[PDB]
Design a protein around this ligand. Structure first.
Ligand code: ANP
Ligand code: ANP
Lengths: 972, 980
């Protein structure tokens, strides 16, 4: 009913839109958007509307209007998942419009494409990308190609991790476009190419990227570029993105003319491919290299060139895992959209899915497939991204039960990659053993192997109590079958030596007694290690935090160690001293094996990880983080990273005048909202109060009234009538699933940088201005927007202050008056103070975000409400929400779990220590586990709580007040 | 003068060596080339040049039959670590002919040339670019042989990596040349030119236009893509300063964009011109480009009708005129010719008017002028800097004292031509002014500032700098107490002088009451912020007297927040603060969102916090965009702010590392007996019957004019030449440091590195790349098919399979190598079969480095670890070490070398050379490139050195009271004289 009301509102608004002119177009587009993205329809979609929208886009007369509506609907912070799939479905029709002969239509189209790319859940990239590749490949309209190329570029910044994985498919499309006959298209393609390469993220070939792009543009530079790449010594993993950029060059190198080049190409092929840890990775490229290698092997006289070529050929065969007769193995299809789609369709065989929801099922399938390529398999991650789409036609409980199952089956398709080899790596072996390990009749390791390379740094991991320390002690004592003797390979178990020196004994004599060289030789090294004479002569009993560690390592040098064994070395060590340790280990030139609960430490030190898997040791190339990507079970170990518990929200910020938690800090009266154009207001005669003790639950089915109430409450929509009050310093945190899903656009940042990214402008970019496009940042000219005040044309000359205006902010603006408009003598003259005027935030942000920001910062500071984005403050805040300080300031979000990402996003959402927390359907994307922790946190929250839900079970023992909208009205 | 015998002997040796060279075949070519090289680069001739030798070389390069041989000699002579300034200018003079050969029909001659050009580019003093560059640009422009063009383009590329900073300033000259080359009909040349162009863009020191570089280059190739490229050009967020390199790449695009038909493109062009140019800080930078932008903008303004496009065009025009300092009638400001070679050349010639400079020294005077021209462009004005780079060429034909006196006048006159420059502009930056004053400042009747101005922007960060005692603190106090005329009152702009507040709080008062007593809000409100700030409940309740230094600072910033400060004033805020707390302060100042003014002797702290630098200059205040590092670029004089006292110039060398079996400083750690060296091909040994010893107490002076004997003796002493006969005892662990001027000049190729990184670079392979293997090309990094070098052992062809150990051999090292024996070598069955340990053999280091450097470094590294001599390159050790040499630790790990002065680069180079704590320091003619101040400090350092010192010099004055042992070569013989 209140839901059937929504369908009507959309009709009125869409009616006004189709008639819209270039003058009011944006005004109504905005309305359509603010309404459509709200909780307006109960378990269904406004089918007719989308139908008219679709039709409107294909008609010259309404093309501009329809699309401009989409652009607004698809803004960066408010695109509702209930709407998203239907919007992406319009991309094709919109691409055609990007090729229309009419300038306005063509322009709006291009614009809309960028809007969408920046609006969709980055993970749904497999639902959107094919549309763009299909279009640009099949069209003959050059302008259309340029618009699509520009959308590709926007996508690089919008979904970088996601695009990286698509590289092998995207690079050849851009490469072909680089050869278009239209000069404008050649220009555009190269630019998109350069932008796209930003996802390679490989330090080893970075500097040569512009040399590779040029080569794609001109083959004649291949020999030149091959000659230029010979020396690149590869260290970082060779990803699919690396290959898509390298292989084509090399392939042309092999089929070159001169023997020198063929040889060089081979070297580069060999050098680079050996660093391919996964065969699936090199599979799609094998076809472009094998044939050229086989061929040259037969055709070139010189034997040196041959040996090289063979070596490359052999390398390729080994890594590729090619079957006999050079047959490339069958690629896994666990990530193939076609595959994930079958799984979902299958799981959906018995529930009656109407036709209008088919597109949604498709979306879900796409997202699912991408999560598998990204290897995101934890339950919360999937609930975060798919559940919201499913409740579009299913009930939460059913959707969640079906979802959990979909993830379990989709994950099971993930192929079991192989395990490691060391021989061809760089090192003269310190040991190579086959052995078993028993500690008191208990088997720790059985018929396993251990090979350590010289000057290499290792880390040993495994579930607590698996025998990590016993193994190290064993190595330390030479109780591993086949291990070299101390004379062949000196091991030094750092800080684990036992002797009988008096606490009286000096540091010098302490080491002297170890029989490691003359006292002279000892002072020498101790001084070189930073010891002062005073220290060398003092009693060991006085060495502090860092100095015993330093002393030990110094002894290791004098002992001429070959391997340094360390067990929880960072204990009792401060940050400077840990930093010191990290630097030393990375530069002492000796092999070191470490056991440490500090994953940050391990990431900074280890080059390899030896993991306990059963009664077997398994080697992985990379640090702890790289380790975890290749071995999920590790996220359940006892490392600093895996640590996850419950959380607490911070105490709200001080408020003067508020003595009791029952005092109203927000009180609305006779409030009413009505979209310009609708027949009757969406909500009216509204009255309510909020306090630090509030515990409200906005229940009921989605409808025109219920959403609009949420939208006025959260500041999005400015009430059309009535009085609104709130403390000057009252802050409301709005928690939507949007932020949870969209954090995937920042896997490259540390939790702390993410919090800065969302906060430095002074306000939460995630929730503030949800009713505006904001997409404006490169608008040097969009700053010349003309404001109509007192019937005169004006440009903003400056914004000076701020003040509350109902549920938002107004800003004091000085102006420039337009004169002789349209004439050669047109000029904008500065006006006087007297003519300044207050302008609502919504009318400024789109063209003057920067000035608005500088103003918000001032007022923040002037009211003492500003909280500084310092790494210390952010770690403290994140601590409360269950995240560890070291991980918050040094680890990249990419390594976090779905659950941890939940904490981080909540942390972000509550950083300004709000007084009222408004949660938008939290059960719609959080599993029972996450829901639990959230429940307790909300019970203990010292501020007001407003939960928008459908789950009564979730509201019980949590809320006490109830808000319900019936016929555009409601009563507390 | 007085004839110098040993020196005359050198002329004869080079004659015998040249005769062997002109006869050399592709087989033994490299062998003699190396011979010629090692000899010619030594202290072989007294104040002169081997005139006829360079003539023979030039004549041989021009002759088919000897081109290859002669050029190969030039290549070895021009190696990366040993080219001597006594020869450098003569070598460069040969480039023209070498370029011509790069276009020779002969496959071999053409190839050797190409390689030689790369060799010279990588060997010259980067600072002498202006002497080399012209040869290459002129050569590529007038030649019609495409192969020559490809060779020269390769040389340009090499230059970018060899002298990045220097090339950056040459961009506006290089880019047009490369652009033309891209229009060459020959397909291979176009590709090659485009590659060189891509490489050159690397001089653009920012990322502003990274994603558009390939497009800009493609656009130069096909100008019909200009319109679309102007569209793509939404770099709109231009942030870094626009330099000559940036302009050289942008202006040609934008200039064509202005002349394009569509008004949309004329408009877009102007928008970009506007946004980019208002980031130009020196009008002289854009001056040479104005002529390609002013006319189009003027024309478009008169031609376009659309008002918007007109506004945008005009705006760009106003910005261009402002930033370009254009005068009346749009006249381009007079270009300063301070950096023109013609200008510095005129200056030196004038100073040398009463000095008879023979025709054979004319090339040197020109070389000297080129260098001086670059120093000015690079704004390198200190005395030591010039003495490091120019004095060594000058003594080719002048006595040191005369050279130094004229050099010092040359420097002063050249530097005086540097245009003073217009001040900086804050207006178009991002901020609403907090203030804008015109004022004078007096303190006790003493004038600190006379009629100057001060403009501060909200939320911006400034640093105040000025020579010691200029009044920086008084100005801050003045601001804090509103004593700067026209400054806002406290109500309008609340300033807080952090930690400089005075009140009468008891040492008993709790932190909370302390803040409360200042009347800054209720106690509840105060607690909320302190906690938000990081204070615990315990601390808020404890007595203020209990707070550490770190918390008093944090408390002081918290109070400023409660007072709603608009400006934070900080004076020496890092004092009494550990690195953690300083790190925290940095972080807070960068995110508090409040304007802050800082005074700190810590340039590193200034760099992490400051966006602008307000510098005291005379009695005026001058603003500069950027932090301290950027500031010092525009104001070179700033590198001497901590100079006033003579003590800051001193340094100490490290204690030589421990050696077992040496209990007296007289104990010989090096002993050479019956030593003799004779170049294969010379009629007699250069030195013979040589006996000497070195101990930790050595204090030797290798006196006498330059000569064949003196130089060779030194060359054996330092490890370069392996003796032909005689015994050599050395210790398994004895280390020698060879300080040559080369390292001091070539550090100008690493201005981008921090001192710490520079040292890491020099010892990358565990050994000093500057002084090790000076007799080898070693430029083999991309040596993949040269590792397939076939070693003939016991008459059998073999390839090295692996190097396993090291052992001392004479004055160098031999390596324990495992082999791979080849069978059917040339046939299709050729297979290099690995041999057994029993066939391993010991090969001298000289024979492995050029083809197996990596493997050798790995062994040298194991031996260092095993002998417990290895010195890890940890930040702490490097800092600790450089501090001994008189360099601040902060600077060493965080500041770029570009910001150091000539005197500071000297400390750094010395720090690099003594990093491994040698037991003997051998200094090659230190007085030839060090000014009085530097020599003073060095002499004291050498006098105190706990290891041995060997000084090769001509100055008896410098050695008086330093050395007592004397080494004087006479007729190929030398017997130590003196005492200890
Ligand atoms: N049109 C829609 N699009 C997307 N999600 C929706 C839509 N309508 C409801 N939801 C979500 O579906 C979930 C509600 O599931 P549901 O089974 O209806 O709960 P419930 O306890 O049965 N409430 P009820 O339907 O009143 O009995 C919530 O997350 C809603 O936000
Ligand atoms: N051929 C040369 N090329 C470059 N530099 C040289 C050459 N010959 C000498 N020098 C340098 O010229 C400087 C010597 O100048 P000089 O005036 O001879 O010093 P001195 O103390 O007066 N010794 P003396 O010449 O015996 O009176 C030293 O730096 C030499 O290394």
């Amino acid at each position: 009913s209140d839901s059937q009301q929504s369908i009507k509102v959309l009709e009125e608004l869409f009616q006004k839109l189709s008639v819209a002119t270039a003058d009011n177009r944006h005004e109504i587009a905005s309305e359509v958007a603010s309404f459509l993205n709200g909780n307006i329809i109960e378990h269904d979609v406004p089918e007719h509307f989308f139908g008219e929208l679709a039709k409107g886009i294909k008609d010259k007369k309404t093309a501009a209007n329809a699309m401009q509506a989409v652009a607004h609907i698809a803004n960066q912070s408010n695109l509702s998942p209930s709407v998203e799939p239907y919007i992406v479905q319009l991309v094709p029709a919109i691409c055609t419009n990007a090729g229309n002969k009419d300038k306005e239509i063509q322009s709006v189209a291009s614009e809309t494409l960028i809007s969408i790319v920046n609006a969709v859940n980055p993970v749904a990239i497999k639902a959107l990308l094919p549309h763009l590749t299909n279009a640009i490949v099949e069209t003959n309209k050059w302008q259309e190609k340029i618009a699509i190329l520009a959308a590709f570029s926007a996508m690089v910044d919008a979904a970088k991790d996601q695009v990286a994985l698509r590289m092998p498919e995207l690079i050849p499309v851009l490469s072909e476009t680089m050869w278009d006959t239209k000069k404008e298209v050649k220009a555009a393609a190269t630019a998109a190419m350069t932008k796209a390469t930003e996802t390679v993220d490989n330090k080893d070939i970075e500097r040569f990227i512009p040399s590779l792009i040029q080569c794609i543009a001109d083959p004649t530079e291949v020999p030149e570029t091959v000659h230029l790449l010979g020396a690149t010594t590869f260290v970082a993993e060779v990803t699919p993105a690396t290959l898509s950029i390298m292989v084509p060059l090399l392939s042309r190198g092999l089929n070159e003319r001169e023997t020198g080049i063929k040889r060089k190409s081979a070297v580069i092929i060999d050098n680079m491919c050996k660093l391919v840890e996964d065969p699936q990775v090199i599979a799609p490229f094998l076809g472009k290299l094998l044939p050229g290698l086989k061929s040259n092997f037969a055709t070139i006289a010189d034997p040196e060139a041959r040996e090289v070529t063979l070596r490359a050929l052999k390398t390729l065969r080994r890594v590729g895992n090619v079957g006999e007769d050079d047959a490339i193995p069958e690629l896994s299809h666990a990530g193939d959209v076609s595959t994930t789609l079958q799984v979902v369709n299958e799981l959906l065989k018995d529930e009656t899915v109407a036709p209008r929801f088919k597109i949604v099922v498709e979306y879900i399938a796409a997202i699912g497939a991408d999560l598998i390529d990204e290897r995101i398999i934890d339950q919360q991650a999937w609930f975060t991204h798919i559940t919201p789409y499913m409740t579009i036609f299913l009930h939460e409980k059913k959707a969640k039960d079906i979802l959990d199952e979909f993830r379990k089956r989709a994950v099971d398709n993930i192929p079991v990659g192989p395990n490691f080899d060391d021989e061809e790596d760089e090192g003269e072996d310190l040991c190579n053993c086959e052995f078993s390990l028993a500690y008191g009749a208990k088997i720790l390791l059985n018929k396993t192997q251990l090979r350590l390379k010289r000057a290499r740094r290792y880390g040993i991991c495994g579930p607590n109590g698996c025998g990590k320390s016993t193994l190290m002690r064993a190595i330390a004592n030479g109780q591993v079958d086949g291990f070299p003797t101390q004379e062949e390979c000196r091991t030094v178990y750092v800080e684990h030596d036992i002797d009988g020196t008096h606490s009286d004994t000096s540091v010098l004599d302490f080491v002297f007694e170890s029989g490691v060289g003359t006292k002279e030789a000892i002072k020498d090294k101790l001084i070189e290690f930073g010891f002062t004479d005073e220290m060398i002569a003092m009693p060991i009993s006085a060495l502090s935090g860092g100095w015993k560690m330093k002393l030990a390592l110094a002894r290791a040098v004098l002992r001429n160690a070959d391997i340094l064994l360390l067990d929880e070395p960072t204990n009792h060590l401060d940050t400077v001293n840990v930093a010191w340790l990290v630097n030393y280990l990375n530069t002492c030139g000796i092999t070191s094996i470490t056991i440490s609960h500090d994953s940050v430490f391990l990431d900074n030190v280890c080059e390899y990880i030896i993991n306990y898997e059963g009664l077997k040791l398994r080697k992985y190339k990379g640090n702890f983080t790289e380790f975890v990507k290749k071995c999920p079970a590790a996220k359940a170990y006892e490392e600093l990273s895996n640590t996850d518990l419950e959380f607490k929200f911070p105490e709200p910020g001080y408020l003067e005048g508020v003595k009791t938690k029952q005092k109203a800090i927000v009180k609305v009266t006779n409030m009413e909202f009505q979209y310009p154009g609708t027949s009757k207001p969406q909500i009216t005669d509204i009255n309510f109060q909020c306090s630090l003790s509030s515990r409200i639950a906005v229940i009921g089915p989605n409808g025109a009234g219920k959403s609009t109430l949420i939208n006025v409450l959260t500041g999005e929509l400015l009430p059309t009538s009535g009085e609104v009050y709130t403390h000057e310093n009252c802050r409301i945190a709005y928690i939507k699933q949007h932020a949870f899903a969209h954090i995937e656009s920042h896997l490259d940042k540390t939790p702390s940088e993410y919090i800065q990214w969302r906060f430095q402008t002074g306000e939460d970019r995630e929730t503030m201005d949800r009713a505006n496009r904001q997409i404006n940042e490169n608008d040097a000219e969009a700053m010349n927007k003309i404001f109509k005040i007192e019937g005169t044309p004006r440009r903003i000359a400056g914004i000076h202050s701020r003040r509350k205006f109902k549920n938002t902010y107004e800003y004091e603006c000085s102006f420039l008056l337009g004169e002789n408009i349209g004439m050669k003598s047109e000029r904008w003259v500065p006006m006087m103070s007297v003519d300044n005027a207050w302008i609502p935030r919504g009318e400024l942000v789109e063209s003057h975000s920067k000035m608005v920001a500088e103003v918000d910062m001032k007022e923040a500071l002037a009211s003492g409400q500003f909280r500084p984005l310092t790494r210390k403050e952010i770690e403290e805040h994140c601590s409360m929400l269950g995240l560890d300080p070291e991980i918050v300031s040094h680890s990249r979000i990419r390594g976090l779990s779905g659950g941890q990402k939940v904490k981080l996003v909540l942390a972000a959402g509550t950083w300004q220590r709000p007084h009222l927390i408004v949660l938008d359907e939290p059960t719609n994307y959080l599993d029972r586990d996450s829901l639990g922790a959230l429940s307790k946190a909300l019970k203990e929250f010292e501020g007001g709580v407003i939960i928008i839900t459908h789950s009564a079970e979730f509201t019980k023992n949590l809320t006490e007040e109830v808000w319900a909208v019936k016929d555009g009205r409601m009563t507390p």
